């Protein structure tokens, strides 16, 4: 398992945490408990500048973890709800698809590698532009956020 639910007290899924490159990562804005006995007990380092927090995965979950890539050429990508378009510096999905609870979900290329983590989105034009976290070829973290983004 490399994707885990983040839940509130009533067991409602409010976001997601993911296992990637030796770390468990989740949007900082999602205040809930990761639905896993070990992951919910780890010490997380916060990074409010990129709306995220992480902890080191136990060595045994490392094999199960997602791989990340800075390679995100223009085109179409994959995510839980279908296709995600990457065009003109923007990841977009159809209107009426994403919403609260989808933060923490990865966007993946066809090889299954993660190219971005969803934080929220904003309706722009006839579609919805996504606020996301990525890392460039230099390993630099980048949070890209459309104006009037709603946290998911």
Write the layout of secondary structure elements.
Layout: E1 3-7, E2 13-20, E3 23-27, E4 33-34, E5 45-47, E6 52-56, E7 75-79, E8 82-87, E9 90-94, E10 106-108, E11 114-124, E12 127-135, E13 141-144, E14 150-151
Antiparallel strand pairs: 1-2, 1-4, 2-3, 3-6, 5-6, 7-8, 8-9, 9-12, 10-11, 11-12, 11-14, 12-13
Structure description:
The protein has 2 domains: 65 residues, Trypsin-like serine proteases (Thrombin, subunit H, Beta Barrel), CATH 2.40.10; 86 residues, Trypsin-like serine proteases (Thrombin, subunit H, Beta Barrel). It has no helices and 14 strands. Strands 7, 8, 9, 10, 11, 12, 13 and 14 form an 8-stranded antiparallel sheet that branches. Strands 4-1-2-3-6-5 form a 6-stranded antiparallel sheet, with no helix packed on it. The chain is globular. The two termini are 22 Å apart. This is Capsid protein. It is found in: Virion; Host cytoplasm; Host cell membrane; Host nucleus. It comes from Sindbis virus subtype Ockelbo (strain Edsbyn 82-5).
